[PDB]
């Protein structure tokens, strides 16, 4: 309703809703994947998913 | 990667993933071939012309 500024959203937003806890949360989310997974475990050349 | 020197061994983690795959795969029991005796009885007995 483009006639009222009143009800308008003061300030306008345009940012994420929170960048910064979905950031943590995916943080997180990829750790637990990446050192989750079991592996093959001696010697430290033996748990290396990638070489150098 | 430098395992212990007898018979099959895996010089590398990726050895070490092909020496899985191949005991996975049971082929350290490959199965009975023919005997050389029996076989070759049974050979002349049959690849031969019959009635001659």
């Not at chain 2, 350290?28 to 050979?43: C, G, H, M, Q, R």
């Amino acid at each position: 309703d483009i006639t009222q500024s009143s009800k308008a959203p003061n300030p306008p937003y345009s940012q994420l809703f929170n960048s910064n806890v979905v950031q943590l949360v995916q943080n997180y989310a990829y750790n637990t994947f990446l050192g989750a997974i079991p592996v093959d475990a001696m010697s430290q050349s033996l748990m290396n998913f990638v070489t150098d | 990667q430098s395992g212990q020197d007898s018979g099959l061994t895996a010089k590398s983690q990726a050895q070490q993933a092909l020496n899985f795959i191949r005991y996975a795969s049971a082929q350290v029991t490959p199965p009975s071939l023919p005997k050389l005796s029996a076989y070759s009885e049974l050979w002349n007995q049959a690849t031969a012309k019959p009635n001659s």
